[PDB]
Ligand binder design. Structure first.
Ligand SMILES: OC[C@H](CC1OCCO1)Nc1ncnc2[nH]ccc12
Ligand SMILES: [Cl-]
Length: 167
């Protein structure tokens, strides 16, 4: 039993809800919140920009130190950093950004990072400003993640379409 409330069960372990991931994280304070990161951990917009804003830019400061030490992430890769005031940890995961010409097959590799954590609050990878088909992102999530994932979808119109089109 966990404190995630109001989710629709798509599968044994995949759940979905229309919610602002920032407001969800602030309410639940999950062990792991997933960020829709880029390889430079530059959290300028989308989910990443909103999560970083909610930390008063502390996420960006920590991320800049991480990059200075370790260099960029790989597309499909991840790193674990602090969750600041939002969660215990933030799993920064880089899905392919279609608007940069990155291979959509890497979306499965990106979701595989979730399997290293028993429970996560997450957005749909490569959706939104990363330019992939969100119905596809949900399909890959359900077919790749085996741990318990609570998916937050900000756009209500999109949420209804994902549910009604889910197989
Ligand atoms: O796949 C990422 C989704 C994309 C979907 O389509 C257009 C907007 O929402 N973005 C978000 N999902 C959850 N919380 C969020 N906070 C800020 C952005 C955001
Ligand atoms: Cl987005």
């Amino acid at each position: 039993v966990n404190s995630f409330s109001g989710y629709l069960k798509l599968t044994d372990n995949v759940y979905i809800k229309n919610a602002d991931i920032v407001e969800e994280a602030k309410k639940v304070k999950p062990t792991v919140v997933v960020n829709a990161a880029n390889v430079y951990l530059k959290h300028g917009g989308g989910v990443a920009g909103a999560l970083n804003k909610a930390t008063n830019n502390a996420m960006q400061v920590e991320s800049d130190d991480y990059i200075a030490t370790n260099g960029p992430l790989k597309v499909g890769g991840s790193c674990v950093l602090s969750g600041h005031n939002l969660a215990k940890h933030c799993l920064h995961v880089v899905g392919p950004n279609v608007n940069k010409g990155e291979d959509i097959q890497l979306l499965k590799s990106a979701y595989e990072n979730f399997n290293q954590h028993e429970v996560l609050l997450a957005p749909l990878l490569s959706a939104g400003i990363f330019g992939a088909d969100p119905i596809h992102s949900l399909r890959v999530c359900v077919d790749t993640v085996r741990t318990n994932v609570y998916l937050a979808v900000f756009d209500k119109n999109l949420y209804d379409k994902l549910v009604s089109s889910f197989l």
